[PDB]
Amino acid sequence: SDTVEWFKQAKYGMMIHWGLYSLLGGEYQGKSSSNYAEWVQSKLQIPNKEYERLTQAFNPIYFDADAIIDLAKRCGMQYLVVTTKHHDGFAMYRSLVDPYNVYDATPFHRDVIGELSLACRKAGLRFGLYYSQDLDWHEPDGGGYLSNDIETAGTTWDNSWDFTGEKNYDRAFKHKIMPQIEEIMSNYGEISVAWFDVPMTLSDEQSQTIYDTVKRLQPDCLINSRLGNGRYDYVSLGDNEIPEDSDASDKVDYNSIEGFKPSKLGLYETAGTINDSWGFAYHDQNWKSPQTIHDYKAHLNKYGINYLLNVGLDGLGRVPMAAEQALLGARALEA
Amino acid sequence: SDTVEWFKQAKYGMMIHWGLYSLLGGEYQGKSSSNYAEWVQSKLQIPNKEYERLTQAFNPIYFDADAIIDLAKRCGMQYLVVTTKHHDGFAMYRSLVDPYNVYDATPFHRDVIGELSLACRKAGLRFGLYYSQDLDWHEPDGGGYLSNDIETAGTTWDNSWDFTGEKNYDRAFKHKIMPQIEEIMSNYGEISVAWFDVPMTLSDEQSQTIYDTVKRLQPDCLINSRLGNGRYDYVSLGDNEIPEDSDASDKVDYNSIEGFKPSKLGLYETAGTINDSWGFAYHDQNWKSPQTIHDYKAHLNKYGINYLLNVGLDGLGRVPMAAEQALLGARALEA
Amino acid sequence: SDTVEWFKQAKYGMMIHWGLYSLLGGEYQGKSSSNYAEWVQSKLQIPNKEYERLTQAFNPIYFDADAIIDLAKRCGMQYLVVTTKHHDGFAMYRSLVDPYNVYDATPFHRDVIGELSLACRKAGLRFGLYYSQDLDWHEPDGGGYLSNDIETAGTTWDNSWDFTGEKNYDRAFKHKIMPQIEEIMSNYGEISVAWFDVPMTLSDEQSQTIYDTVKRLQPDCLINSRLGNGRYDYVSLGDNEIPEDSDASDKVDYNSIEGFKPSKLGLYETAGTINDSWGFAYHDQNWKSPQTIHDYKAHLNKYGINYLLNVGLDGLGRVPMAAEQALLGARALEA
Amino acid sequence: SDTVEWFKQAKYGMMIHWGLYSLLGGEYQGKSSSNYAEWVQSKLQIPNKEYERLTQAFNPIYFDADAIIDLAKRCGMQYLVVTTKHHDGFAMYRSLVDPYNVYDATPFHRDVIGELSLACRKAGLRFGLYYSQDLDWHEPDGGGYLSNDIETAGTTWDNSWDFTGEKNYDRAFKHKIMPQIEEIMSNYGEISVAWFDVPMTLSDEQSQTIYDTVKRLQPDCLINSRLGNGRYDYVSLGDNEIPEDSDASDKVDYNSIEGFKPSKLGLYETAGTINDSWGFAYHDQNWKSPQTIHDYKAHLNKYGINYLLNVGLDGLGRVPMAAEQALLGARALEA
Amino acid sequence: SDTVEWFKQAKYGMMIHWGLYSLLGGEYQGKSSSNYAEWVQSKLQIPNKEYERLTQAFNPIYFDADAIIDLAKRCGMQYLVVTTKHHDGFAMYRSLVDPYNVYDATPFHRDVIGELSLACRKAGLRFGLYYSQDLDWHEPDGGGYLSNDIETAGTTWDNSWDFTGEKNYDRAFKHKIMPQIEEIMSNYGEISVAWFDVPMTLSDEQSQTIYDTVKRLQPDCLINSRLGNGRYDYVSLGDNEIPEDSDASDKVDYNSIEGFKPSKLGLYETAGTINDSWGFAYHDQNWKSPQTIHDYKAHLNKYGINYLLNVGLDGLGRVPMAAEQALLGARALEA
Amino acid sequence: SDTVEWFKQAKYGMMIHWGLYSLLGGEYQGKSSSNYAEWVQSKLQIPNKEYERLTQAFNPIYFDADAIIDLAKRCGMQYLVVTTKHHDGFAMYRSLVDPYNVYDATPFHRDVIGELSLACRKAGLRFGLYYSQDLDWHEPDGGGYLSNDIETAGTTWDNSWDFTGEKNYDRAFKHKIMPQIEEIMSNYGEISVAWFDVPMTLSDEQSQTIYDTVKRLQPDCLINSRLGNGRYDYVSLGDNEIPEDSDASDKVDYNSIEGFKPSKLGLYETAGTINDSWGFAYHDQNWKSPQTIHDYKAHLNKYGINYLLNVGLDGLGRVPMAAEQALLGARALEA
Ligand SMILES: C[C@@H]1O[C@@H](O)[C@@H](O)[C@H](O)[C@@H]1O
Ligand SMILES: C[C@@H]1O[C@@H](O)[C@@H](O)[C@H](O)[C@@H]1O
Ligand SMILES: C[C@@H]1O[C@@H](O)[C@@H](O)[C@H](O)[C@@H]1O
C-alpha cells in the first residue's frame, strides 16, 4: 500500500481536539476538570441538558482551516487528525444521524471537519479522523458502564448521572456509532488515518465490524490499535508515552491504551500534547519548549515512531499563541 | 456626608473589568498583549473594524450578577466598581448615545451594568462605576494624542492607527464623554463611587464639568483622583500600589497616576489585581495567594486605605476559578 | 372644549388589555390566576427572571390593528383605550426609557401602540392610553408596598418576592413613571383619554405632576379618576360597576376605585368586560350575551355614563371569537 | 410475547395530541372548528401557504417532556402514545424526508418525539407513536379523496382546496408515508404501540406493507386496528367509545372506526379525551370529573380494555391545568 | 410513450435560471461578466470562500412560484424547466448530500424547486429540471479540467483558481453528481424533462449511469442530448440556435452543444433567451421584441422543434418587467 | 467663512442616493417607475405596509464606505452628500425619533450615515447630508398635499393612498422633521453641506426654523436653496440642469427647483446623474461617457458652478460598474 509506505516515513503530524468542552476550558461553575479539559462533563457530571447550552455560545469567529493547515505544513507535519466526535458525543461535522452537531445546533452553522478536509487537500497534507466509538455521554447506551472500577480523568467512563437504568452498548453501536462512522468515512474524501479511542466496552465482533466498514469505505485508511480487540493496522502508544531507549529498541491486553503491542507492518505513533491537556484548558500554561518538542520528535522518529502532536483550539477557534510559538520554534531548530 | 463616613470604614471592595477584550484574553492573531490584556487593541493596533467583530462572539451564557455580588459579599467586600466603558470605547450598558454597546451590538442583548446594579441593591452592597473619560479608541477625537512621549501598556494612548489626522478631544468630550456620563449617572440608581482614569488630555475645566455633572446627578457619589486636575473627593493610588510604611503613614502632578496626593477628607484607595492583569488573560496564572491578599488588605487598611480588588471576568462571564479560590481563601484567613 | 362635548355623547368605547400575561392565559406551572389573568405574576409570585422568558414566545402573527379598529367601528364604538403598560411593567410600545418592551425584547419587534394609533386615526376613532402609574412589578420601587393590608386579585400589590428591601416610590416615579408618561403622550399623536389605575401609593403632588404633564403634552386629553388624589377630568366607576337606578340618578375616598365621585364636567365611564377577565384567560368562557351587553350599554348611557367595554387579546393577537360574536350580536340589537 | 402480556395488563396510558393546530386552539380568523380543533385546517379550508405561517409562532417555552412523563407515571399510566404527524401533515420530529416539521421549520428547533422518547425511557414508561398514514393535507396525493360522501369533523377528508386535480395516494404512500414510518420506527428506540388512523384510502397491500415494515423495524410493536384492512394486533374502539356491559362482555368493516372487531390476541383499547377535543381547544372547558375518569377506567378495565386518555397540549407546550387536575384527581380516588 | 407524443406537440416552454449569480447580476468588484452572467464566478475567478458570502444576501421576498407559472400558462407554455444546480454548484433545492443549497445556507430557508413543482402541478404544466452534471466550481473534482484549450464564457471550464492540484471527475461523480441527481429525480414528483449540460468530461459509462438512474426513478422523463455520449431521448440544439430552413428541414460529435444530432423519436428543442443572458444581468437590456419571439416560435414549431424560452429571475426572485412584457406581447400576436 | 471660500473652489462632489427603493430598482409587481426609481412608492402607490417588507431584503454585503470615498477622492471630488432620508421617509442612520431606519429595521443593523461620515473624515473629504424636510410618505402629515395640481415623477407629492384624511404638515414638522434634522446635525461630526429638497408645503417660518437649527448645531454648514422661502446660503439649480453659457454667465419663485435665484455669496451647484436616475434603476443603462462628464464639469466650473454628481448605489451597496468606469474615465481626461 501507498499509505503504509507513506506512514512509515511521515514522522510528524498535527492532532486537533476541539468541541464544546473547549469553551469551558477546564472549569465549570467554579470547579475544576483534571488536566483533561475535554473530560469536564464526566469529571463534574454536567447534565446533558446543561452541557447543551454551550452550543449557544459556540461562534468561533477566528477559526480558519487554511491558516491551521498552513501552520502544520510550515512545521513539516505531513498529516492532520481531528476530533469528529469526542466522548461528550457532540459531532464537529454535519451529521444527518444526529442533530447534536456543530452545523445544526450552533450559530456557527459550519461543518468544521469539511473545512479542515478541504484545507488539507489543497495544501497536500493527509487527513485523519478521531472518533469516540465506545464512550458517548450523550447516549444512554454509550460505553463505559462495565469499567467503573478503573479510575478515569472524569468520574465514570459512561454518563452515569443522566442515565441510570439498564444499558446495552449494542443499541448505541447500531443506531449512532456505525451510522456516524459511515458518514465521516463517506463525506470528507480520502481518509488516511482513523483514530479510535478507549475501547472499554465494544466486543471483538464490534471492533471487527468497524474495521471492515472503514476498509469498505476507505480501503487505504490505516486504523489505530485503540479500535480495540486487536483489529488495527498500527499501534498507538499511551497518551504522551515517550519510551526509554531500551523499550523503544525492543517493542498483551488489546484493550489497554499504554505500552507496545504487536505491529505486523512495523507502524507506530505516539500522540502527545504541547502542554498537558488535549482540549484547551485556560489554566494550563505548562507549554513544552521548542527544544523539548524537537528532541521528542527526534527520539520517537529515530526508533520508527511517528509523533502526532496535538493542538487544542480555544473557544474562538484559535491555535493558542504559546502553542504556535512552540511549534514554530521547534521548526526553527531543524537543520 | 454618609458616603464619606461609609467609605472611610468600607476597607474592601470588588472591581470588575469586563469587555470585548476579555474574549481575546491577552492574545490576537498569534501575538501577545502586555500584562494588560484590556490594552490589547492598542498594543497590537487592532483596527476598529476588526475589533468590532468580537461583538458577534459575545454571548456569555454563564454571566450571573447575583452570584458575582454574592461572592463579593461573602468575602466581606462592601462595594463593587464595574467598567461601564474602558479605553476601547465599548459600553457595557444600554447607551442611547452610542450603539457600540453590549445591549445593541451583541447577541447577549442585555444591560450588564443594569443587572449588576440591581444585584448590588438586593444584596445591600454599594455600587460604583468606572468610565474611561479621556481615552476612547473607538472615537477619532479620543484622548491620548498629546501623551505619546510617555510609554504605555499598549503602543499609543490614543487610537493612532485608524485615526491619523487632526484631533480635538473637545468634540469627543461634548458628543460622547459627557452624554455617556449622564447616562450612567442617571439610569442605574444611587452611585457611591465614580472611577475615572488616565487623565492624559482633558482640561481643568473639562474635569470640573464632569465633577459638577456627577454631583448634580449623584450628590453622594465620591469621585476618585484620576478625574484629573485636582477635581476629586478621594485619592486613587497607583495600580497595585502598596506604599511603604512611612509613606503610608505621612501621605504634585494632579494628572499622574502614581503616589499620594492631598485628600482633605482623608480618603484613599488602592485598586489592585489578583493576578497581574485587569482584563482576563489566558496567559496570566500568577495568582496571589490568600495570605498575600490578606496581608495586603491588612496593611492598606491599618493606614486608612481601602483595598479595591479586581476580578477580570472571562469570555463566558465567569469569575476565574483561581480568582474565586484566592478570594475565599483570604476570607478564611480572617480568624 | 371639543373633547368634553365629544366624550359626553361618545357612549361606547373599546378597551384593550394585551401583554405577556395574555400568553399565560390565566395559568402558570399548573396553578391558576384568579378571575384576573393579568394579575398572574402577583398571584403566583413569578420572579421577574422567569416571567421575562415570555418575551421569547411573543410573536403574535395574527395581530391586526386595522381589523381590531374596524370591529370597534362597526359596533359603534367611538374610541379605543389600550394598555401601554400594565402592572407587570412591560411596555407595549417602543420605550427608550426601558428596554423591557414589546419592540426591543420580543421577536415581534413592532410598536403595538404605534400601530393602534395609526389605525384609529385612519378610521376616525379617538385614541386613549392606559398606563399603570403606581404598580410596577418590574421595578424595586414600584408602588403598592404600603397597601398590603388590603387583599388583591394577586398576593401583594407590589412585587414583594423579587424585592424585599427598603422601597421608595419617589425613585420609580422619577426614573420610569414620568419619563414613560412623557413618551406615550408625545409619540402617538392626539390622545383623547388617559386611563390611570389603582393609585395605592402616589402623593397628591405626584398625581398633580402627572396631570400637569399630560395637559402640557395633550391639552385636550381627558384624565380618569384613578390618577388619584382628585386629579382628574372624569369619573371611572368600579370594575364592571353598573349602578342601581337611584345611584345612577344622583351620583368620598379619592383613591378608592368603587362608586361615584364628584365630576365638575358631568363626565362618567364604566369600564367592563365581556367575560369576567381583563386579560385573556383560557378558562373564562362566561361571555355575556348580546342582550346583556345591549342592556348594560342602554342603562349606563341613559344616565350619561359611557360604556368602555374591554377585549383581552389572545397570545396570537386575536379578538377571541366569542368576544367578537358578543359585540356584533349587541350591535345587531340596536335596530 | 412479552409485549402481548404487558399490554393486556397495562390498563391505562396517556395519549398526546400536539401540533400547529394547538396554537389556533379551535378558532381561525373569527371562525370556529367543530369540537375537533385538530381538524381546523379542513374545517375552514386553510390554504397550506397560510397554515404554514403558524411555524413562526411555534416557540413553546414551557414544553417539558420529563414533567409530562412524570404526570403520566404518577397517574399509573404505563405507556404514552404521541402524534408524530397528524392529518395536517406536520411532523413533530426531525424528518429528513420532509422539512415541514417542528425541528427544521420552527424557532423551537427541537425534536419533540426525541425528547418524549428519552423521557419515557428514563421513567420506565413504554413509548408509542401516532401517525396519520392515510390523510395528509400537506400532500397533493394525501388520502381522503374517495370518501367525501361521508361526513367529517372538517369539510373533506383530503385537502381539496389547495389540490383540486387528479390524485393518486400511491405516490404519497411511496414518497412520504412509508419513508416517514421508517424514520419514526428507526430513530426513537423501542416502540411498543403503533397508532394509525382513519384508513379511508389505503389498500390491503398498503396496510400490509406498513404492517411488515413496522414489524421488521420494531418486532415487538403492537399495531392498532385503524391501520385498516384487518392488518393489526389489537382493536381500537371508537373515539371515546365506552361500550355497554353486554357488548363489552361479548365483543365487520375493517376500515370503520366504531365498534368491536375480532382480536386473535384478546387485545382492546379505547382512546378517549378529558374534555371533548383531541387537540387543545380554547373554548372547550367541558372537562370530565375525577369520578367520571375513574369510573370509565374501572369499566373498561374490568372487561380487559385499556384506557388511552388523551391530553392536548397548548401552544406553550403545557398540559392544561384542568386536564392535570382531572388526572391527579382520578388517581387520588384509587385506594 | 405519453411523454413522447406530448413533447412533440408541446411547442413552447419556459426555462428558469436562478441562483447566487443572479444577485451579482453580471458584475463583481467593478468587473464585468461576459453577458453570460451565470458564468461570473469563472469569468472573474471568484474564490468559493468569497462567492459563498452571497448566501447571506439571498432573501428574495418577491419570489412567487404560482405567479411565475401563471405567466407561463397565459403565454401558452406547456412546461417549465428550472436550474436545480448550475455550474457554480449551488443547489436551489433542499439537498441532504450538500448543505451548499438555498434551503440550508440562506435566510430564505425555502425549497425553490419544491415550490415550483407544486405550482406546475396545480396549474397542469409539466415540470423539468436542469442539472449541471459535469461542471461544478464548488467541487475540487468538478469537470472541465480537460477542456481548457476551448474558449468559454468564463476563463476555465473548471474551478482552476481554488483547486490547483490533481483532479479526477470520478470522485465528484460518485459523491455529489449521482446522489444529487437521485435527490431531484426522487423528491419533486413526476419529471417530464431532464436538462443536462456541457458534457466536457464525463465518460460514456457515466452518461449511461445517469441515463439509467433517471429512468429508474422517472420512467417517463425525456433526457436531452447534453447528457453527452449519445445517451439521450431528444436533441437540444445550440444556445439560441435558430436553424436555417434547409438544416431545420433535414436534421457527429455527441459531446458538442451546437447543431443537429440523430433523434430516433423525432424530438428537438431549442433553448433561447429573451435578452442575451441566461442568468439575470443588469447590463443586458437587449430584449427581443414580441414580433421576434413570435417569429422564432413559429419557425421552430413548423419544423417540429420546441422553443424553450428562458427567464433569468432577479435577486428578488422577480421576472424582469421587460421580459414579462416581451412574453405577453408575443402571446398577443397569436390571433 | 472658511466653508464659503472652500465651496467656491470645491468644483466637484459626489452625491449618493441609497435606500429601500434601490432594491426595487425601478420596478414593482410588473410595473415601472419613471426614470425616477426613488419615486416608485408614489408612482405605484405602494402601501407603507407592503413597502416596509423591503427592510427584510436589505443586507448589502458589498457596502464599503471607505471604498466609495476612495473612488470619490481618486476622481478629485472634494465632498460627498448622502441621502439621510428621502421622500419615502426611511432613515439611513440610527434615528431614536423613528425606528423606520436602516439600523433598527433591517438585518444589516448598521448606521450607513455614520460609516460614510467616518470614511470622509479619514480621507479628508467634506461631508454633506440630504434630507427630505417636506415630503415624507411614511407620515400621515407629510408634505405635498397642497401641490397635486403640479405633475410629479410619481402620482401625488404626498402619500395620498395610505392617508386620506385631514392633513397638517405642522405636526410632522414638529414630531419628525425637526427632531431628525437635530439628530443628523448632532451625531455625525462637522457637516459642510445641507441638501434639502422640494419645498412644496413648509412655511417661511418653518424654513427659517430649520435654517436656524442647522446653524446652531453646524455653524459652518452651507444650506441649499431647496430649504425653500429664500432661507439658504447657496443656490441649487434644477435636476441635471446644465445652463446655457449666457445664463451661466450672468445668473423669482423661491419654492421652485429650476433656474437661478440670487446668491449673495456667489455660490451655485448643479446636482446631476451619470445615467438618468437618482436612485438605482435596473433598466437605466443610459450612462454618460467620460467625455460628457468631463465637459459638463468643465462648463459648470468655468462659470463658478459646482458639479455634484450622483451615484445611485445598488441593492448590494455597490457603485454600479458603469458609473465607476464613467467617473474614472472622466478623471483620466484631466491633463
Ligand atoms: C382519536 C381521533 O382519531 C381520528 O378519528 C382523528 O380524525 C381524530 O380527530 C383524533 O386524532
Ligand atoms: C443554457 C446555457 O447552457 C450552457 O451552454 C451554460 O454554460 C449556459 O451558460 C446556460 O445554462
Ligand atoms: C435630486 C432629486 O431631487 C428631487 O427632484 C427628488 O424628487 C429626486 O428624487 C432626487 O433626490
Short mmCIF file of C-alpha atoms and ligand atoms in Angstrom, two decimals, chain F residues 15 17 36 38-39 83 86-87 130 135 157 195 197-198 226 239 257 271 278, ligand 3:
data_model
loop_
_atom_site.label_atom_id
_atom_site.label_comp_id
_atom_site.label_asym_id
_atom_site.label_seq_id
_atom_site.Cartn_x
_atom_site.Cartn_y
_atom_site.Cartn_z
CA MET F 15 -23.83 62.60 -4.25
CA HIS F 17 -28.85 58.15 -3.23
CA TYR F 36 -37.08 58.26 -11.10
CA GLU F 38 -36.60 56.60 -5.91
CA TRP F 39 -40.20 57.77 -6.62
CA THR F 83 -29.39 60.82 1.45
CA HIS F 86 -35.58 60.51 1.11
CA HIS F 87 -39.27 61.06 0.32
CA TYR F 130 -29.51 65.28 2.08
CA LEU F 135 -42.21 65.12 1.61
CA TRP F 157 -46.43 64.51 -3.91
CA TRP F 195 -29.18 69.50 0.96
CA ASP F 197 -35.47 69.29 -1.34
CA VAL F 198 -38.86 70.02 -2.94
CA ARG F 226 -34.39 73.98 -1.74
CA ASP F 239 -32.09 68.36 -11.50
CA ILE F 257 -36.49 73.95 -8.10
CA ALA F 271 -26.62 68.18 -8.97
CA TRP F 278 -31.05 59.28 -8.87
C1 LIG G 3 -32.18 65.43 -6.82
C2 LIG G 3 -33.57 64.82 -6.93
O1 LIG G 3 -34.40 65.69 -6.17
C3 LIG G 3 -35.79 65.75 -6.34
O2 LIG G 3 -36.27 66.40 -7.55
C4 LIG G 3 -36.22 64.39 -5.95
O3 LIG G 3 -37.67 64.45 -6.03
C5 LIG G 3 -35.40 63.39 -6.73
O4 LIG G 3 -36.00 62.20 -6.33
C6 LIG G 3 -33.89 63.44 -6.37
O5 LIG G 3 -33.45 63.33 -4.93
#
